[PDB]
Each structure stands twice: as structure tokens, then as C-alpha cells.
Amino acid sequence: PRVLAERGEGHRFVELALRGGPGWCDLCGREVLRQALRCANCKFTCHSECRSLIQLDCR
Ligand SMILES: [Zn+2]
Ligand SMILES: [Zn+2]
Numbered sequence: 001p002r003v004l005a006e007r008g009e010g011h012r013f014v015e016l017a018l019r020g021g022p023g024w025c026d027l028c029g030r031e032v033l034r035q036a037l038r039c040a041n042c043k044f045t046c047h048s049e050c051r052s053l054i055q056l057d058c059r
Pocket of ligand 1: 025027028029030046047050
């Protein structure tokens, strides 16, 4: 059923399906070979790996 990512008090990071071509970690400005996760609550669509650099939850 629906991915209840909302369960977390912290960043949801909802993954965006790569449209048959690249996507961009808006955070990095660099292309996301892997499915970028987007915390729709406040931040950006970042590399899965880049999520590590986020030590502060939803604004
Ligand atoms: Zn990144
Ligand atoms: Zn957030």
C-alpha cells in the first residue's frame, strides 16, 4: 500500500523514480546515478549517500 514514510518524526526522504535518464542531487548540484531521496517536508532530493550529511531534521 502507500509508503507510510510519514511515520518518522524526522526527514521522510521520499525517493524519486529516475525517469529513464539522470536526476540531480539539488543539494550537490551533481547527478544522482542512484534514486535520489526527497524530504518533501522541507529540504531536497539528495543522493542516498548524501543523506548522511544531514544532521538536522525537518525544518
Ligand atoms: Zn548529493
Ligand atoms: Zn524534512
